[PDB]
Amino acid sequence: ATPRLQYFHIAGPGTREYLSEDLQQFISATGSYFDLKNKFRQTVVAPTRNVTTEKAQRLQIRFYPIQTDDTSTGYRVRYNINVGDGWVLDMGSTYFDIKGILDRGPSFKPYCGTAYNPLAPKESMFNNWSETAPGQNVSASGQLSNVYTNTSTTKDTTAAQVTKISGVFPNPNQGPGINPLRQVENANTGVLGRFAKSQYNYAYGAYVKPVAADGSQSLTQTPYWIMNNAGTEYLGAVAVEDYTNSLSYPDTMIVPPPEDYDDYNIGTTRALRPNYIGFRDNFINLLYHDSGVCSGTLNSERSGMNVVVELPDRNTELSYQYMLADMMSRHHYFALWNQAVDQYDPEVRVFSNDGYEEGAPSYAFNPEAVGAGEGYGPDLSQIKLYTNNTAANDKNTAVTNATTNFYFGTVPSYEIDISATQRRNFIMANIAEYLPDRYKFSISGFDATSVAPTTYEYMNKRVPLTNVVDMFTNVGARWSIDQMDNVNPFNHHRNWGLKYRSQLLGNSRYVNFHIQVPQKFFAIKNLLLLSGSYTYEWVLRKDPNMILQSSLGNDLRADGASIIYNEVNLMANFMPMDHNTSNQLELMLRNATNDQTFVDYLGAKNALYSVPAGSTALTINIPARTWEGMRGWSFTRIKAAETPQLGAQYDVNFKYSGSIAYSDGGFYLSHTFRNMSILFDTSINWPGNDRLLTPNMFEIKRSVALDTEGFTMSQCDITKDWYLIQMATNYNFVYNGYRFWPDRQYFHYDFLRNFDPMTRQGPNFALPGLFDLVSYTPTTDNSGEQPSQEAVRNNSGFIAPRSWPVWSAHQGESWPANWPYPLCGQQAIQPGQVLSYKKFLCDNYLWTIPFSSDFMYMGELTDLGQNPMYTNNSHSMVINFELDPMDDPTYVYMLYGVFDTVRVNQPERNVLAMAYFRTPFATGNAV
Amino acid sequence: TSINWPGNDRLLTPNMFEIKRSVALDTEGFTMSQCDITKDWYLIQMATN
């Protein structure tokens, strides 16, 4: 351009063509050790024509609904996407601008613990006052902190404070105000206090809403004078306020003792379980995908024929999950699409018990350094000091007056091992509370069958058994709690993805949410719409269980959750390219030979096969079929209670609000898969070439205890054959050697990223010794007492009794522990009294078996998928599964390998036509 | 004194680069990514970067 600009290489020719050829050869040859390319400048220049219109064209267009039909299960919206000539719409830029009111219900705690007197001890009381009538039979217990240096024997100095009582003056926040507590004379100190007469005396979690603008939780205060046994000696005064009906305990629940201790013991109070009710990852289950009854609609006006056809056997939202996880790492939190992957804390799931950081003995000392707590030794209180005589080596002269404290011993202190305190609190709060309901018991005020197990206060008022999980539970083994490894780990308050998603809405259950939801259906997920007038209808879910995710998985419909949609607009971004260039573009995309073609990323027909609780085996029969281009198999097992009805507008049997492992990638039951077999004909096994070490089945895992010949890989119970197949599928190289593949560690759904082999040893019970003191079965009684837990005697006088609830106050006496049998050390049990428990966990993996001759990837259209023996011949393959028996009805999420592809034909203006074809499992009915 | 640089009805508010707006005062949307940043500003930043 400008010679002035070409001089400075701002618009010049370019480094390749202004540098002398010999210099270019030099800087290319000597470019690995002495760089010179950074010293010469070349500028990339914009096309400056035929890239943007001068015409006034909106850069971002909002489409507000034509026609709504607000209903009580969904929220339909219909738009008229008018794309003029010279315009071009990429539907990847089309998203729903949704705002409304969200109610997350009473079952929503965005925070562990409480906000009301958190530092208060759990069993403390807020300076009680129990009376039948004012001035009648009265019981009161509390601290009297305020002082007013009274001159006793008269009311002159006490009545002055009494007249001030009728306000905020007692001021429970303020105390004595003196740091050295030894300087007070007990006869000229004055005493004041402020007590509350109410039911449910507990300091922890106590809340009384204010009535005046300056504290003042009550309006009427009745003062009471403090005198000794005689009435003449005036000592102090007390403020008493009625909180009988003005007091409440939000976010806290009373943990009463067993019924035998209901009286004479108020137990402790505990904060409710923390529950996060934010939206789901990537706004999953917020648009009605794959539901024929409430399917979306996209079509032109001239031909009002829908082009989006949805199938109940496809999974659009899991497809988007897999697509996004392959496109980027899942640890990136993109707050726009609510892109926060559901992740469990590994320190909670794969429990690596290690005790605690044992350091020097740690003590909490007196606030001052002088005290007589447990006043052993000489009293040292009425002593007298005489000065020393060096010559006589004895006392010589008395000290006239010596006000001395002079206590005995070191600083009074109480020893706490906070390193183990954190460990126990962590275990009980994270791993113990999230135990299955079969390892819990009521609290002597709660009763089962009076409320659904899927409710909030059911989970809150059921204390887990305290010996199934504790600090001695596999004290040195990195071992997930086998009583809980079948529990969805993503239903946890440590779900950082869910925590972030629930924190994006706010800190209350009354949310005026404003969200943007993308279109995930693969045919129009990123379709480029040409010119024409199209109508684009969709319906938004209003099911509280589906749209919202809980960290507890409780039934939100029974928990008052609801949502209201006010404005649902359709945003779009239009590139302002030149009408000449956009007209050329649309002319060349209206040509038949080159037209948009999209395949769903999952590429799987999704079939759910029910497996009841007791069943350990599953037989899958598929009738005669053409298996053309079928990619392979993929499968996990999903709990039935955690999976909605496929293609149902509203599921009433779905009383779960955690992580639907079907909808998202939150798979956690890839284990509990004993083996598998595939038989294309009635008896012809698929590998069927002596490939595997077990030729006629896919032995996924075998117990090492019964293992004798080997056939187990990677220091767990997985087999050689299965490990080989999985590594060959995921990484394509097993015949040149097994190795780690860090190129796929971002995927969040591959094998090595989340395959965790485990090994614990454990005592060998069913021996003359080794009595197995841990009882895993509760007594399923109303009383909050579990006497079967009283056999462990560990931390006897320093924790709550095992029969008592976990979070009750401590009582007992110090005693040698008896339960944890030493598996290490010099006094360990004999080698014949230990066992082996090789096990593996594999979350979010979705076992894959590729329909390839050698289990390795040679193209999306597999080796055997195009073989003219499955494609042309009809085969009726039979799958036989063997599973670990679970304790609830579970599906087996089976995924085949399909080419569910669509190519979009847009020959003229407002003519939109789509052809859907799925190679193994087509849906053409020839009508 | 009369030439808006976008000046072609580009932004949802053609006459200014509305960086953020009060969601309480909001009526028609124009707030993006679950905060008070605007659709136009979000588009501009994402396109630039």
Number of alpha helices (DSSP H) and beta strands (DSSP E) in chain A: 12, 37
Q: Which two tokens stand for residue A49?
A: 């024509």
Q: Answer yes or no: are the C-beta atoms of A437 and A411 closer than 8 Å.
A: no
| Mutation choice for A interface testing from B33, B46, B49 by most A CBs within 10 A | B33
Which chain B residue shows the shortest CA-CA distance from A334? B33
Q: Measured between alpha carbons, how far is A201 from A223 in angstroms, rounded to an integer?
A: 20
Residue in the block written with tokens 């837990």: A789
Would you state the structure tokens that stand for residue A555, as one six-digit string?
A: 């039934």
Chain A residue whose CA is closest to B35 = A514
Point out residues after which chain A has a gap (C–N over 2.5 Å).
Answer: none
| Closest CB to B8 among A56, A516, A569 | A56
- Three-state DSSP at A734 gives coil
Nearest residue to A207 via CA among A246, A172, A245, A248: A248
What DSSP string describes B1-49?
----SS-SS-SSSTTS---B--TTT-SS----TTSSB-HHHHHHHHHH-
Of A60, A567, A569, the CB nearest to B40: A60
Give the A-side interface with B, CB within 8 Å.
53-60, 62, 97, 99, 335-336, 338, 504, 512-516, 567, 569, 571, 573, 576
Residue showing tokens 């013991």: A265
Q: What are phi and psi of A315, to 5 degrees?
A: -125, 95
Give chain B positions within 8 Å (CB) of A338: 34
- Chain A residue nearest residue B44, CA to CA: A59
E strand or H helix that includes residue A566: strand A562-573
**Hey, CA dihedral for A762, A764, A768, A771, is it positive or negative?**
positive
Token pair belonging to A412: 């009074």
Please give the method by which this entry was determined: cryo-EM
Q: CB–CB of A504 and B34 under 8 A? A: yes
* Contact (CB, 8 A) for A474 and A424: no
Give the residue on A whose Cα is nearest the Cα of B11: A59
In this structure, the number of other CB atoms found within 10 A of the CB of residue A590 comes to 17
Alpha carbon distance A904, A912 (integer Å): 7
Cross-strand partners of A620: A879
Type of residue found at A582:
S
Q: In this complex, which of B11, B23, B29 lies closest to A59 when CB atoms are compared?
A: B11
Q: Between chains, do A573 and B29 touch, taking CB under 8 Å as contact?
A: no
Q: What are phi and psi of A152, to 5 degrees?
A: -70, -175
Q: How far apart are CA A186 and CA A235, in angstroms?
A: 10
Q: Can you say how many angstroms the Cα of residue A662 is from the centroid of all Cα atoms in its chain? A: 17
Resolution as reported, in Å? 3.4
Residues ≥6 apart with Cβ < 8 Å to A871:
A626, A627, A628, A629, A865
Q: Do B40 and A59 touch (CB under 8 A)?
A: yes
**DSSP string for residues in A256-280:** PPPGGGSTT---EEEEPPPB--PBP
Alpha carbons A865 and A151: distance in angstroms, whole number = 101
Asked if residues A405 and A181 have their Cβ atoms less than 8 Å apart, the reply is no
Question: How do beta strands A130-131 and A138-139 pair?
Answer: antiparallel
Q: Are strands A247-248 and A221-227 parallel, antiparallel or unpaired?
A: unpaired
Q: How is residue A737 written in tokens? A: 């050697």
Asked if A733 and A751 touch (Cβ cutoff 8 Å), the reply is no
Q: Residue A57: list chain B partners with CB under 8 A.
A: 8-10
Are the beta carbons of A665 and A280 closer than 8 angstroms?
no
Question: In this complex, do A514 and B11 lie within 8 Å of one another by their Cβ atoms?
Answer: no
CB contact under 8 A, B8 and A57: yes
**E strands, A813-909, where?**
839-842, 847-850, 878-883, 890-896, 900-905
What the block records as the tokens of A160 is 């002055």
SS3 of A478-538: the string is ECCCCCCCCCCCCCCCCCHHHHHHHHCCCCCCEECCEEEEECCCHHHHCCEECCEEEEEEE
Residue A563's nearest CA partner among A517, A491, A509, A520 is A509
Q: Helix (H, G, I), strand (E, B), or coil: what is residue B48?
A: helix
DSSP state of A428: I
DSSP letter assigned to residue A128: B
DSSP state of A806: T
Q: Which residues contact A746 (CB under 8 A, 6 or more apart)?
A: A328, A329, A330
Contact A269, A121 (CB under 8 A): no
From chain B, pick out residues whose CB is under 8 angstroms from the CB of A512: 23
Furthest CA-CA distance within chain A: 125
Residue of B12, B34, B40 lying closest to A514 (CB–CB):
B34
A528 membership: H or E segment, kind and range: strand A528-529
Phi, psi for A82 (deg, rounded to 5): -95, 105
**Nearest residue to A712 via CA among A725, A722, A697, A727:** A722
Distance from CA of B8 to the nearest CA of A (A): 4
What length is written for chain B?
49
